[PDB]
Design a protein around this ligand. Structure first.
Ligand SMILES: O=P(O)(O)OC[C@H]1O[C@H](O)[C@H](O)[C@@H]1O
Ligand SMILES: O=P(O)(O)OC[C@H]1O[C@H](O)[C@H](O)[C@@H]1O
Lengths: 246, 248
C-alpha cells in the first residue's frame, strides 16, 4: 500500500528506470523475490545478466534460476573472487551459461591487479561483463562496519575500512567505494587492486539494478543512485523512507 | 582367454595399483567410464572426506554421476588446477549446500613470473594447500598422440606448435598440463610447466589415493606412463585400452 508511493517518489527523485519497494518486516529473502521478479520482466530470451556478489544478489539468483534456464539467460561475473559467487551459482542447472572471471577479487598490489587484468582469460570475461544487457549488484555501507559482507569475507581489513570511512566513503559496489554525493573516492588503494570492472565501465550496461536494504544502507544506496551506478532499485519500505529523507 | 577381470588383476599387479576397474568394450565409453569411476569413488570415500578434482571430460562425467553421493555424504571438493570455467560442467550439477573450494586463477599464466606471483596470492595459496591435503583425487590423462583432439588443445590451453614441440621433447601425455615421458618422468625443458598455477605432480602424490579415469587406445602409452611415474595409483579404464596398456 505505502509501497507504490515510495516507488513513485524514488523513481522521480533519482531519475530511475524501475523501482520496487517491498513491505517492511524476513527482509533479505523478500528482497531476492522482489529483485528476481523485476529481472523476470526486464530480461528477454538469451540476454546476458552480469552479477555481483553478496547475500542479496545470491538470493536473487536462487529465485531466478528457473527463469535463467527456460529463457536461456547467460550469466557473467562482474568481479573476481569465484568462491563468493558459488552459493548463487550452485542453485542453477549445469546447462546454464556462466562466465566467471578467473581471478581473485583483490590482488596484493596494483601492479599484480594490472597484470591479472591483462591476462587473456581474464580480459575476455571483463569485456563480456561490460557488454551485458542487465546487471544486478548489492550495495555495501561503511556504516555496517564489521557486519559488511566485504569485511566478513576478508576482502578489506578493519583498519582499511576505518581509513576508507575517514576519507569520506559511504558505501561500495564490488569494492569500489564512493562518497555521499556518489563520487568514487580517489585516494583509496584498494581500487587499483580490484580485478573486476570499474564502476565507470559498469555504466555501459543499460539497466543496472541494485538490491539492498536495512536503514543502515540508506545513505549508501542514495549515493549509489546519485553516482549513476544503478538506475533501478529493489529495497524495503523502511530503507526507502530513510533514503527519501537523506 | 583374458576378459576384464583378468585385465584388472594384471594391471593391479603390473603397476602396483590399489584399485582398478576395467569396463567392457561393447553403450558409449566416456559416459560408462564416468559411471565406473563414480562407483569406485563411492566405495573409497568416507563421509566428510575431501576429493581433489582435475578437469576434462572424463572427470566432469564422473562428478556428474557422483553428485547425489557428494551431497548425502557431505564430500568436500577442491580443484587441483586453476581455470575455474573448466570445472563448471561438473560442479554446476551439484546442489548449493555442497562444499566446493576453487582455485581463483587461470590454469596457465602468460609467463612463469606471473604464475609464481599468483601462486603466492593468499587466496590461491590457501586452496593449493587444501588440494594437497585431500583424501582422494580424481584426474583425467591426456595423450600427445590425440593431437588436435586432446582436451588441453581443444580448450585452448596449449597451441598446436607447443604440442608439436612437447612431443619432440619426448612427452607422451599429461595430467593437469604437466607432461611426462614414457618412463613416467616429468619433462623438464617445457615452459608450460612453470606457467601452470595448480599443484605440481610431485605435490599431487601427497594425496593417498589417486584415481585416473581415461580410455581410448591412443591414451594407452600415456596411462601406462602415468602409473609408472606414480601420479595415479588407481585406474578406471576400458577393455581395449587395458589390453593396449598391458602390451605397452
Ligand atoms: O550486503 P550484501 O547484500 O551481502 O552485499 C553487498 C556487497 O555487495 C556489494 O556490491 C558490495 O561489495 C558490498 O560490499
Ligand atoms: O581427455 P579428458 O578426459 O577430456 O581430459 C584429459 C585432460 O585432463 C587431464 O588431467 C589432462 O589435463 C588432460 O590434458
Amino acid at each position: 500500500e505505502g509501497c507504490l508511493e515510495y516507488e513513485t517518489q524514488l523513481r522521480r527523485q533519482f531519475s530511475l528506470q524501475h523501482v520496487r519497494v517491498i513491505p517492511g518486516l524476513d527482509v533479505g529473502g523478500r528482497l531476492g523475490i522482489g529483485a528476481a521478479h523485476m529481472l523476470m520482466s526486464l530480461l528477454q530470451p538469451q540476454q546476458m545478466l552480469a552479477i555481483g556478489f553478496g547475500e542479496a544478489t545470491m538470493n536473487t539468483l536462487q529465485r531466478l534460476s528457473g527463469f535463467i534456464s527456460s529463457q536461456q539467460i547467460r550469466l557473467v561475473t562482474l568481479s573476481g573472487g569465484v568462491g563468493s559467487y558459488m552459493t548463487g551459482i550452485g542453485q542453477l542447472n549445469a546447462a546454464c551459461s556462466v562466465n566467471i572471471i578467473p581471478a581473485p577479487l583483490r590482488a596484493s598490489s596494483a601492479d599484480i591487479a594490472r597484470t591479472l587484468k591483462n591476462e587473456n582469460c581474464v580480459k575476455d570475461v571483463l569485456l563480456a561483463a561490460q557488454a551485458a544487457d542487465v546487471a544486478i549488484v548489492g550495495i555495501g555501507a561503511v556504516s555496517q562496519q564489521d557486519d559488511a559482507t566485504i569485511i566478513r569475507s576478508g576482502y578489506i581489513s578493519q583498519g582499511e575500512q576505518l581509513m576508507i570511512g575517514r576519507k569520506g566513503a559511504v558505501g561500495d559496489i564490488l569494492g569500489y567505494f564512493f562518497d555521499a554525493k556518489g563520487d568514487v573516492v580517489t585516494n583509496i588503494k584498494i581500487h587499483n587492486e580490484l580485478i573486476g570492472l570499474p564502476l565507470s565501465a559498469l555504466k555501459t550496461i543499460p539497466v543496472r539494478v541494485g538490491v539492498a536494504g536495512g536503514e543502515n544502507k540508506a545513505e549508501a544506496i542514495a549515493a549509489a543512485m546519485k553516482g549513476g551506478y544503478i538506475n533501478a532499485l529493489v529495497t524495503d519500505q523502511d530503507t526507502a523512507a530513510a533514503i527519501l529523507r537523506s
